[PDB]
Amino acid sequence: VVDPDIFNRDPRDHYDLLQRLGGGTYGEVFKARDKVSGDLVALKMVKMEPDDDVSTLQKEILILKTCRHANIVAYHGSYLWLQKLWICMEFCGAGSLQDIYQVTGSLSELQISYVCREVLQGLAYLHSQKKIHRDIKGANILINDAGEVRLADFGISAQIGAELARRLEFIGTPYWMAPEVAAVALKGGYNELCDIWSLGITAIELAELQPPLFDVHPLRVLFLMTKSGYQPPRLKEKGKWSAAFHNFIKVTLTKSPKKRPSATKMLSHQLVSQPGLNRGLILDLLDKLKN
Amino acid sequence: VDPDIFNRDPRDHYDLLQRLGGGTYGEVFKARDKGDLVALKMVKMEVSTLQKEILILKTCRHANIVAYHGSYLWLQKLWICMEFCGAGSLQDIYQVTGSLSELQISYVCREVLQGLAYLHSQKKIHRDIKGANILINDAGEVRLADFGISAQIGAELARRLEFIGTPYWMAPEVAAVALKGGYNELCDIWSLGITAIELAELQPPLFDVHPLRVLFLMTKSGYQPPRLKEKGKWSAAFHNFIKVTLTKSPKKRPSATKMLSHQLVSQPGLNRGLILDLLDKLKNG
Numbered sequence: 116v117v118d119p120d121i122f123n124r125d126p127r128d129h130y131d132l133l134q135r136l137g138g139g140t141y142g143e144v145f146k147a148r149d150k151v152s153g154d155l156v157a158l159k160m161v162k163m164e165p166d167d168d169v170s171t172l173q174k175e176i177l178i179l180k181t182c183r184h185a186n187i188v189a190y191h192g193s194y195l196w197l198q199k200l201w202i203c204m205e206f207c208g209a210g211s212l213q214d215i216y217q218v219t220g221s222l223s224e225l226q227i228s229y230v231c232r233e234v235l236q237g238l239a240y241l242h243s244q245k246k247i248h249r250d251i252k253g254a255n256i257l258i259n260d261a262g263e264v265r266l267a268d269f270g271i272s273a274q275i276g277a278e279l280a281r282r283l284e285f286i287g288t289p290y291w292m293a294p295e296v297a298a299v300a301l302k303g304g305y306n307e308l309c310d311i312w313s314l315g316i317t318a319i320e321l322a323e324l325q326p327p328l329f330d331v332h333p334l335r336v337l338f339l340m341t342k343s344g345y346q347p348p349r350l351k352e353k354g355k356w357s358a359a360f361h362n363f364i365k366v367t368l369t370k371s372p373k374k375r376p377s378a379t380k381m382l383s384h385q386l387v388s389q390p391g392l393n394r395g396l397i398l399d400l401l402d403k404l405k406n
Numbered sequence: 407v408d409p410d411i412f413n414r415d416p417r418d419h420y421d422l423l424q425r426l427g428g429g430t431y432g433e434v435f436k437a438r439d440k441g442d443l444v445a446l447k448m449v450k451m452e453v454s455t456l457q458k459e460i461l462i463l464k465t466c467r468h469a470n471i472v473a474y475h476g477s478y479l480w481l482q483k484l485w486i487c488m489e490f491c492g493a494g495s496l497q498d499i500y501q502v503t504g505s506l507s508e509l510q511i512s513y514v515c516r517e518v519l520q521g522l523a524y525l526h527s528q529k530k531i532h533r534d535i536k537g538a539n540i541l542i543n544d545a546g547e548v549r550l551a552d553f554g555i556s557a558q559i560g561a562e563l564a565r566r567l568e569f570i571g572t573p574y575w576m577a578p579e580v581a582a583v584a585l586k587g588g589y590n591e592l593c594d595i596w597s598l599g600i601t602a603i604e605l606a607e608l609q610p611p612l613f614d615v616h617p618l619r620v621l622f623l624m625t626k627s628g629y630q631p632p633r634l635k636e637k638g639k640w641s642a643a644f645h646n647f648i649k650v651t652l653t654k655s656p657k658k659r660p661s662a663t664k665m666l667s668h669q670l671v672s673q674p675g676l677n678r679g680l681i682l683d684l685l686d687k688l689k690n691g
């Protein structure tokens with residue numbers, strides 16, 4: 116089955132569907148209003164026909180329902196009704212940061228610092244649970260109408276958890292296989308510090324409206340990262356950003372994962388521990404979006 | 407598609423004699439050209455992984471890798487024609503004869519390393535070196551076999567790459583796992599170390615421990631590579647060969663070509679006559 120706690124009932128008995136959200140980038144997502152509280156939620160609808168694979172969807176719900184942290188999108192349960200799965204989540208009324216900067220242009224360094232602190236808080240919590248987001252980017256950082264920051268979309272993370280379970284289920288007899296082969300089969304070949312690198316790239320994304328090498332063919336970018344002399348990217352405009360921001364980029368984009376700072380360590384960095392970082396900075400951004 | 411497929415009736419060319427392998431390697435027949443003997447593996451045509459397996463065997467041309475002769479397509483059945491190894495696998499052998507002598511193990515290890523060094527310079531990985539996949543012919547000569555696991559891993563690596571998504575936010579270690587899999591050909595060197603213990607003791611180390619427990623242990627970093635059970639039975643050279651092939655760190659594990667310079671497999675007197683002696687034991691015991 117997909118999850119042992121699924122509500123086997125029509126979601127429309129609890130929510131009035133209001134409008135579609137996200138333009139389809141996140142699937143079929145509906146804005147909905149609770150019929151008793153009046154609170155707003157987002158409902159993602161996924162098809163669940165009898166003989167489809169449920170493993171990835173199962174992993175995604177398992178990840179969502181065991182998170183209870185302010186900087187992670189809240190989970191309110193799922194509804195299975197007539198071969199449709201509705202995932203009920205916290206509604207973030209300003210969309211993703213990508214939705215926002217595609218209108219406003221590049222974020223200020225202080226706005227990027229607040230965002231980075233809030234994501235690091237969410238990442239420290241996930242890493243403390245032995246979870247890995249693995250798809251940190253502007254599109255998966257959501258903003259509510261109060262200017263707060265919420266990590267969302269564990270679909271990639273669920274995809275990898277499902278691979279891990281399958282490859283482990285059919286790994287076969289292990290008495291002859293090398294330790295490093297067993298470790299890739301059980302652990303995946305990397306660890307939660309990949310999230311720290313992705314935040315570094317996301318910080319550049321917010322500063323420059325594209326990740327580095329966005330205009331390079333994706334298979335070429337993958338190949339360049341595997342070469343011995345590969346150089347981590349940097350911010351484009353040196354004089355636009357303080358040395359603190361430049362250093363933040365340098366350390367998050369540490370090439371060797373053995374030397375890359377963890378999320379708790381990054382929270383002590385000058386850029387995200389400076390005073391004056393609060394949701395008002397993003398309300399300013401939302402006001403610019405509005406004006 | 408394989409451009410060399412023979413689109414004709416294989417029984418128009420071979421007499422099908424007995425089955426072989428007890429079904430462990432699939433449906434494979436001992437065949438006689440209709441005086442040469444071949445092995446014919448048949449598979450029902452429902453297949454990209456089967457494609458990839460044949461390409462591995464077809465492109466390999468080395469005396470220590472089981473030879474490939476061609477494939478016939480007929481009545482939705484694919485007939486893969488290969489070199490026949492009349493003494494079966496080393497597992498078939500030692501289950502009758504008992505543990506191999508150190509000299510016999512040394513010769514088998516040299517022959518397998520020769521095949522591995524060829525494979526690794528072809529940018530291939532066997533990934534299932536074990537007694538069951540090391541075959542012996544009637545001359546006592548050693549041939550690596552069964553690239554099915556190698557084909558499946560290469561297909562999983564290719565497919566998971568085709569659904570990896572945009573890579574601009576990916577860390578370089580994640581990129582490396584996507585393109586290269588997370589390990590390399592030195593895993594075959596470790597598997598050979600285990601195999602040599604298998605040939606000496608009739609079982610790989612930890613054979614009587616639950617497999618999911620053995621997977622749990624191998625990833626703990628406190629993990630200690632196994633050793634030969636009975637010290638006084640084997641020379642210091644054998645023990646050292648086990649030590650170096652079972653190097654935990656893949657960054658320090660010697661390559662196949664380097665291992666060919668090890669004392670155990672470079673000593674004189676290593677030849678097929680040792681396995682002819684073994685093949686005499688299975689006949690006379």
Ligand SMILES: CN(C)C(=O)c1c(N)ccc(-c2cnc3c(c2Cl)[C@@]2(CC[C@@H](O)C2)CN3)c1F
Nearest residue numbers: 136137141157204205206207208209210211267
């Ligand atoms: C008018 N607005 C704001 C939108 O159309 C809009 C938008 N452009 C972008 C993103 C969201 C949004 C808000 N909250 C969410 C979600 C999303 Cl996608 C999810 C996370 C991903 C998916 O699982 C559903 C859960 N909570 C939008 F509503």
Ligand SMILES: CN(C)C(=O)c1c(N)ccc(-c2cnc3c(c2Cl)[C@@]2(CC[C@@H](O)C2)CN3)c1F
Nearest residue numbers: 426427431445488489490491492493494495551
């Ligand atoms: C009476 N004997 C000896 C056997 O039954 C016997 C046996 N017990 C074990 C192995 C073989 C054997 C010999 N030569 C082979 C093959 C195998 Cl399986 C393959 C290698 C890969 C596989 O796909 C087909 C091609 N060359 C046996 F014939």
